[PDB]
Design a protein around this ligand. Structure first.
Ligand code: BLS
Ligand code: MG
Ligand code: MG
Ligand code: MG
Ligand code: MG
Ligand code: MG
Ligand code: MG
Ligand code: MG
Ligand code: MG
Ligand code: MG
Ligand code: MG
Ligand code: MG
Ligand code: MG
Ligand code: MG
Ligand code: MG
Ligand code: MG
Ligand code: MG
Ligand code: MG
Ligand code: MG
Ligand code: MG
Ligand code: MG
Ligand code: MG
Ligand code: MG
Ligand code: MG
Ligand code: MG
Ligand code: MG
Ligand code: MG
Ligand code: MG
Ligand code: MG
Ligand code: MG
Ligand code: MG
Ligand code: MG
Ligand code: MG
Ligand code: MG
Ligand code: MG
Ligand code: MG
Ligand code: MG
Ligand code: MG
Ligand code: MG
Ligand code: MG
Ligand code: MG
Ligand code: MG
Ligand code: MG
Ligand code: MG
Ligand code: MG
Ligand code: MG
Ligand code: MG
Ligand code: MG
Ligand code: MG
Ligand code: MG
Ligand code: MG
Ligand code: MG
Ligand code: MG
Ligand code: MG
Ligand code: MG
Ligand code: MG
Ligand code: MG
Ligand code: MG
Ligand code: MG
Ligand code: MG
Ligand code: MG
Ligand code: MG
Ligand code: MG
Ligand code: MG
Ligand code: MG
Ligand code: MG
Ligand code: MG
Ligand code: MG
Ligand code: MG
Ligand code: MG
Ligand code: MG
Ligand code: MG
Ligand code: MG
Ligand code: MG
Ligand code: MG
Ligand code: MG
Ligand code: MG
Ligand code: MG
Ligand code: MG
Ligand code: MG
Ligand code: MG
Ligand code: MG
Ligand code: MG
Ligand code: MG
Ligand code: MG
Ligand code: MG
Ligand code: MG
Length: 248
RNA sequence: CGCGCCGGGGAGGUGGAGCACGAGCGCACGUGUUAGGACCCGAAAGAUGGUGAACUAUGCCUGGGCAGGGCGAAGCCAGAGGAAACUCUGGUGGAGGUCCGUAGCGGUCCUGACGUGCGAAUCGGUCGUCCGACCUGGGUAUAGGGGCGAAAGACUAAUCGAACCAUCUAGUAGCUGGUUCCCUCCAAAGUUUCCCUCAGGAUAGCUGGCGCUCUCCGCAGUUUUAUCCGG
RNA sequence: CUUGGUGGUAGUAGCAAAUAUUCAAACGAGAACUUUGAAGGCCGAAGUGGAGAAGGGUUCCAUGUGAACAGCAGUUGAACAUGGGUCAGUCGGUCCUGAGAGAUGGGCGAGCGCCGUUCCGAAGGGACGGGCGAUGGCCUCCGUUGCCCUCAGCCGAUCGA
RNA sequence: CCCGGAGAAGCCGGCGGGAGCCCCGGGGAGAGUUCUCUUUUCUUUGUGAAGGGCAGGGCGCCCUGGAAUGGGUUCGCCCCGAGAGAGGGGCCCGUGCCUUGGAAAGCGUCGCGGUUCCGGCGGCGUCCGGUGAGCUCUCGCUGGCCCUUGAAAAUCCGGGGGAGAGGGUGUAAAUCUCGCGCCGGGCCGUACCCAUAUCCGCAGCAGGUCUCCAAGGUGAACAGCCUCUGGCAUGUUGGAACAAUGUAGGUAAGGGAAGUCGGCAAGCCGGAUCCGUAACUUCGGGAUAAGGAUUGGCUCUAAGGGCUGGCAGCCGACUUAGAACUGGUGCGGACCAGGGGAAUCCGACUGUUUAAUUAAAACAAAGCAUCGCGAAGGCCCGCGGCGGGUGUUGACGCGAUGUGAUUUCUGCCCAGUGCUCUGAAUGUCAAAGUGAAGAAAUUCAAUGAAGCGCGGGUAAACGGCGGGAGUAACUAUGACUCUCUUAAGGUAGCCAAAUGCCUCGUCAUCUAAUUAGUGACGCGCAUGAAUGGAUGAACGAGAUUCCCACUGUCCCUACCUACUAUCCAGCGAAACCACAGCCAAGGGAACGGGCUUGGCGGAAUCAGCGGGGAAAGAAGACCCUGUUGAGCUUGACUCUAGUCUGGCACGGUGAAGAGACGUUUUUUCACUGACCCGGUGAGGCGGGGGGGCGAGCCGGGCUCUCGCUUCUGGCGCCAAGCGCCCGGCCGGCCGGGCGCGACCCGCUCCGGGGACAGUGCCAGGUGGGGAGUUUGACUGGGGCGGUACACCUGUCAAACGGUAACGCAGGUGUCCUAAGGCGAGCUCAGGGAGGACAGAAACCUCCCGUGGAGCAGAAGGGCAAAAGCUCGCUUGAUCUUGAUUUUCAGUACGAAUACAGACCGUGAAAGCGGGGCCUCACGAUCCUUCUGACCUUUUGGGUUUUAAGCAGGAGGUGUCAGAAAAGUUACCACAGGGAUAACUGGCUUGUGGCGGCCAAGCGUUCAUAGCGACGUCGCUUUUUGAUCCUUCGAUGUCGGCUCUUCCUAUCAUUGUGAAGCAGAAUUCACCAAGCGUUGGAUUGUUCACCCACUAAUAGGGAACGUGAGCUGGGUUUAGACCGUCGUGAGACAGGUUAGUUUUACCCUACUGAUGAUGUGUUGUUGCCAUGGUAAUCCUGCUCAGUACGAGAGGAACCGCAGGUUCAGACAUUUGGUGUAUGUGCUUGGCUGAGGAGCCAAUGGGGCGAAGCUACCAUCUG
């Protein structure tokens, strides 16, 4: 009968992201002759805490090579970096933390972050707190590379694409228990309206397919098809298994 | 005229809204049955097009606001015992979804007052919390099978288990209710059969009115005499 | 049933939230309630005080009136009738942008129209100096229009406290 | 041009500085006080912005110098070779002080003129000091908090740069962010209220509505209480009374929850100091635990500080400890201000929630555990697009669920139903496409995607977790074993719990007494493991139970106060209303105000009162009917957006192979030009030279790299140089241009995909996410149950025929190749006597044999050379018109009967035969299908396929004269119904209750003292049932409380009879219902059971009396928890907890109160016809330790003394009350002090007159 929560979110308007105090987008430097052939120097002017994000950012100042004008970028901070540190970047960049070079050059077993999935997008994969990717093996023919991501999906990518060296800071966040409702409340106030998560079962049987009944119970099987209309797709999606996960 | 896989006749049964020396059309009047808003008045709902978040639901931007006391976390200072490890004793500091409690915020109980009320939800005394998921003003966003909900089917201008205004719309009713002058003459039924029929119809039955063909031989809710039947 | 009018019920129910009035004098036809004075009380700076906002829109002030209204009366009043009254470079709006709304280009749309706000756009009418041309002035020196050379990143029209 | 800054940031705490206010001590000017005191008490007692100076704070600023035997220093900190202490400096704020403004003005005072209309005019004064945990505002410093780190742009400014301009020793110049001097600053709002009377609520409505300011005292305090500044007349009126009923306030001897569903309400406790403080525990808490003592006034001592020259002297704050005295033991003196403990259940906590009946045990919440997904992606919106949100995002993330802190545990079951993985090993499987014959439409045939099947996996997916047998040396039980059924068969733990019917389970404790409560037991109707089980400190406006103290909650009521009600002056409604308003019985729609018959009846009126008027209220919400709906559900029916899958088109260019049906069907491998994606202010791409740093070869050939930047928080733009040109001036000057410097040529800006995704059109699938609709009838209420819904026999049927009930006894939805058709010939059931095996029963024979057997079936009728049984030949169970009968409307179907015309069968022949000996065994229109004629039409004519026609059978409608169809509503809605229930009322009385007759037996004996079987006759309507006449436009539905009267079927008392009666005690019966019949524990209970006294603890009605008389615990709304059932929405004469109880002023009625006619008027003292009616019972003494009786035991009558209950009065005494506001005391403030007083909603506490008044005092019956 009614339109349920899941559906009401898609139009948005209420659930859009709060973006007053966000500093900006965290994109890498754009491609150009210098990066493609040689290298370009750049200092770390300052570090900054971005809202809604575990990791911190960095005000990185470079110099524009064609016009007399200092550009600026917002890199994501690898661990161990500090202000007053010369950050090189390019093809001929030396291998040490805080230094952007294409993956192809570095050997196998190299740990990287802020990686591009396709060339030019200015850095999409692996840039949250405590993550890093592992370079497994190159492939001279076709000029492509094999890379295992933290989740485990191994992916091939063109060797040309870029990556900032080192892991992302802020690891071990999930270690501390979020003790009180308020401490959670503030977090989701920074990000989005989602926090107080009401169980569908409690609702009346208009607002949920599991609702109603005199006794609190679901009544029907909680596994469900993916060939299914919007409104029903609810519960455990395409559940291959469903139980106390013994072993791994 | 073309002759043949041509045409035409007779008798005898049977089906027909036919013949058998025509009787209709036009106009007016009455009654009766229908179709339409159709004897008058009456719905719960249905569809199309528009208007509202001045209360309230919730998110966001920019502003405002909350005495005085108790409890006394880490850190720090000092003294004492001790072989060492170290441990005991007294001060300081002022933490916290901490405690008593005011304004504010809320509104449990007395099932107290009032109950043609001061009031289409107020008053009294008694109650919970009061630095926090705290309280609040103005601006702004979301609109009806749609919005919004710490989820009660709550709320959406006193209206919500589908809002409000007009139009389609005099919407249908086997159901209640009402239905306007006199006299005279005649005068009933509630039973049969069929129906998604049992609060209803048709259909036979009962009733009236209009007449017409003959009358100054026929018929009867009856007996008698004969004659059968009856279980 | 509809509209309009009138009865009994009735000169009854009733005019009970938060302590409170009293004496003399004046105008006046008339005074429990008007005014002055005197005496006694209350609100007791989280105010029954002094100032503002939104909002109301002449209710502010004076003179006169006593029909109607102020659920008793009233010589009174926020009632009625006459007339008056709001003066800024410096106090605010006006300027700015904020969450956001909203044009243009572009696309969609039988269609009134709608999406979308930098996204598929030839998105500058500006400036200083040089040369050449053109006028106006005690043509001194300096203005006032034009071309050519040389230079220019924006960012999205516009509203929004 | 570039770089950079301000504008530009959160909350909280502490501390310091500066103002305003407050206070103190002296000075002046005027007021008030003076019975007595009082150098008294009160008011008042000033300098703006903008400039200059100086104070006064701050500084992460400089210089000198170099510290450990470490120093300085803050309440806390912190700081130091990255340069401390100690000197000298600098800067920043300067709302404070001085000054120009400015004493002329202003204010306070005294006095002169103007008669006046006057910013009138003159004296004087407007002083000097001190204080502070005080308050308020502000400036600054410094900490603490964050999975929260707390706005932008307009606008303004500084610096790095150095393109360029300027005059030749002067009246110098271009140029100045320096000091004066000139002009101008438009448009619009601007009054007032800003709220117990200017706003919104229909109004001058106790409601609601955002801010600033903010004195004295008491005190922890902005608490409460009183006063000044300022404001006001008690909030839409007054006077006279002071009764009951109310509303809000108080207090009570003795007792202390006994009242009651329940300690509901009120009351006790309350602040501080000093002692003291257990169980348990997540070791933080619990904790103001508990439990004690003190507290006043007045008069003293002592300890804590500043400033200048181990000291002195001058000043000033508030606190703390201590001591003596003194009072009628009063003292936190008013106000403000916590009742406690032991236990159990639930939920962890704080929070939120139904605006207007539910604040909870519901939700959330942290923790836990699953699932999808690496972007051409997941999830969703969207009518649409190369669209949009999450996304300024990227697996420690977004997204979808479940569970509910911690600790501890988390057993077995994948058969079912879901989900999912594998998919030629594969049954089925559409369009198009491909072969096949045919004149062609065609039809046939192969080929064949996903999906269903098939097979794996899965329970922190929905979910589930038996029974029978045998077995231990007492019985029991069953360790152990087997089997049936399913895929296992309840493991660990727990309980008559919020889950247990029977049930008040049983035992113990808790009570004198306990259906409650707590601890064990377990057979568990129906416990149980993240649909989570068990525990568990702290917390709860949560649910129950008990204990302490405490109380007018109760025995048991009384008194007082204010506001009313009451009477008066003024002003002034509405609901409601057929007529009206005294009763009993009677019959009547079965409870009448009117009727009949009886009883009766007297003006007009007041304050109260709640019995009635089936009172008002709202076209009954429960129930039923309705061919009336909505909300929701799913395995109902019929469809749909979306998503998955194949085909055709947009859609190219080449490579190799097999073959394929010079060609292809197709498998791979490329290319790119459509097309698609991403980035850029679309900035140096690919080739070819030349140049260089290195390796190898013979100035030369070849390959690759580079093209010049890695110790450091710097700067970096607007071209140097050269060559070649020339332009004006005069070999030199001034001003110009091009190209190298910075290689040349090109056709897509760079990359990645790419002929596939994709878009458009068809086709199959999936699809309660969504839409539309349906969800039979009869019915002794409906439902559940039957089918009496179409058929047939017998009876009921009352002697023609015809007749009903969910009446009776019963049957049917078939069977037959002959069990049909002719003819002939036989005669059955049963019994008797005989005969080897032979038998009660096997086979043969004679005799009897009216049918006693049989004819498929239900029963009934019918039949003997047959309708039975056996042989022989056959198929009239065929073709075809009409007529009639049965049901009946005298319409159909079916079923059958008489004839007729053909072809036949059989029998010698007359004949017989068109299905089953008779009475039941079955079906319309429309559509499809088959058969049938040299049949008709197929449209301008002709031929031939196909189709349509015509006639006769079949496929089926059993709700059987024929819609195609599942559930729920306690969230509910509408029309109506007493044609129809759940209470009452009526008639009946089975059942229940009571009572008679006969007398077989008990009672030793003796039937009948007392009882009475087998049988039998009656009454009653407080039980229960059966019925539906009344009311559904509403009669308020269970219990208790309170209160009156009434019945008698006598429990006790009075009088008397009879006993298997000696007395006592106890039994049965008559007259008799006037007077009595209790207090409590448990349960909502009526009922039940128990303790205690008694004379006795009998039974019942009146609308199951009694709701505008109460209460609202239970039933019986909405919220929620559990078990079982149901896949689910939901359900339960199965448990649990929270949940608006309306109006009286009418008529009558009763109560009390004025009054009325008549005697001519008026008093007076008096009379009684009528109504009403009252007393009750018990104890002791004596009689009497006697009569009686063996004794044990053991009375009665008259008298005497007292008591209970009830009724009627009074208030001498005791008690209560006490606002005579009578009188002492007293807390805080106010009147200068003393005295005398007042306010604090009765300020508080003592004692208390009068008067009212109590079995709580007394009297009489
Ligand atoms: N959903 C629940 N839990 N219940 C109890 C049903 C609620 C229904 N909707 C109301 C109701 O009361 N139903 C009753 C009402 C009466 C009716 N009934 C009563 C008496 C008699 N003799 N016969 C009846 O049929 O029964 C209904 C019932 O119990 O189902
Ligand atoms: Mg729907
Ligand atoms: Mg649903
Ligand atoms: Mg707290
Ligand atoms: Mg408290
Ligand atoms: Mg009440
Ligand atoms: Mg009102
Ligand atoms: Mg605002
Ligand atoms: Mg929408
Ligand atoms: Mg909320
Ligand atoms: Mg929410
Ligand atoms: Mg609910
Ligand atoms: Mg509900
Ligand atoms: Mg009409
Ligand atoms: Mg109508
Ligand atoms: Mg009716
Ligand atoms: Mg007979
Ligand atoms: Mg009265
Ligand atoms: Mg009166
Ligand atoms: Mg009032
Ligand atoms: Mg009053
Ligand atoms: Mg007061
Ligand atoms: Mg004012
Ligand atoms: Mg005025
Ligand atoms: Mg008056
Ligand atoms: Mg001016
Ligand atoms: Mg638009
Ligand atoms: Mg503007
Ligand atoms: Mg503004
Ligand atoms: Mg002065
Ligand atoms: Mg003003
Ligand atoms: Mg008001
Ligand atoms: Mg008023
Ligand atoms: Mg008054
Ligand atoms: Mg007492
Ligand atoms: Mg007492
Ligand atoms: Mg009792
Ligand atoms: Mg009680
Ligand atoms: Mg109480
Ligand atoms: Mg305790
Ligand atoms: Mg909770
Ligand atoms: Mg509510
Ligand atoms: Mg309530
Ligand atoms: Mg789960
Ligand atoms: Mg489990
Ligand atoms: Mg399975
Ligand atoms: Mg128990
Ligand atoms: Mg178990
Ligand atoms: Mg559960
Ligand atoms: Mg279970
Ligand atoms: Mg359970
Ligand atoms: Mg426990
Ligand atoms: Mg009056
Ligand atoms: Mg009547
Ligand atoms: Mg009455
Ligand atoms: Mg009544
Ligand atoms: Mg109704
Ligand atoms: Mg009705
Ligand atoms: Mg109907
Ligand atoms: Mg019907
Ligand atoms: Mg419907
Ligand atoms: Mg749908
Ligand atoms: Mg419809
Ligand atoms: Mg029926
Ligand atoms: Mg007969
Ligand atoms: Mg007969
Ligand atoms: Mg024949
Ligand atoms: Mg036969
Ligand atoms: Mg038809
Ligand atoms: Mg039919
Ligand atoms: Mg009987
Ligand atoms: Mg005998
Ligand atoms: Mg009836
Ligand atoms: Mg009635
Ligand atoms: Mg009534
Ligand atoms: Mg008698
Ligand atoms: Mg009754
Ligand atoms: Mg009532
Ligand atoms: Mg009553
Ligand atoms: Mg109940
Ligand atoms: Mg189930
Ligand atoms: Mg008498
Ligand atoms: Mg004797
Ligand atoms: Mg006395
Ligand atoms: Mg007294
Ligand atoms: Mg004195
Ligand atoms: Mg006394």
């Amino acid at each position: 009968g009614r339109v349920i929560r899941g559906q009401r979110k898609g139009a948005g308007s209420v659930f859009r992201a709060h973006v007053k105090h966000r500093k900006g987008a965290a994109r890498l430097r754009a491609v150009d002759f210098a990066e493609r052939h040689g290298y370009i120097k750049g200092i770390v002017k300052d570090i900054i805490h971005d809202p809604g994000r575990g990791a911190p950012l960095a005000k990185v100042v470079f110099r524009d090579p064609y016009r007399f004008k200092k550009r600026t970028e917002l890199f994501i901070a690898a661990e161990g970096i500090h202000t007053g540190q010369f950050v090189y970047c390019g093809k001929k960049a030396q291998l040490n933390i805080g230094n952007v070079l294409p993956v192809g050059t570095m050997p196998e077993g190299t740990i990287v972050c802020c990686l591009e999935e396709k060339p030019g997008d200015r850095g999409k994969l692996a840039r949250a707190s405590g993550n890093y990717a592992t370079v497994i093996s190159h492939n001279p023919e076709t000029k492509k590379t094999r890379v295992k991501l933290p989740s485990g999906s191994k992916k091939v990518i063109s060797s040309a694409n870029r990556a900032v060296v080192g892991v992302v800071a802020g690891g071990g966040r999930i270690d501390k228990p979020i003790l009180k409702a308020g401490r959670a409340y503030h977090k989701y106030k920074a990000k989005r309206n989602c926090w107080p998560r009401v169980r569908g079962v409690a609702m009346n049987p208009v607002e949920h397919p599991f609702g109603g009944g005199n006794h609190q119970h679901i009544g029907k099987p909680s596994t469900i098809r993916r060939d299914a209309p919007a409104g029903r797709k609810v519960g455990l999606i395409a559940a291959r298994r469903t139980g106390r996960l013994r072993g791994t």
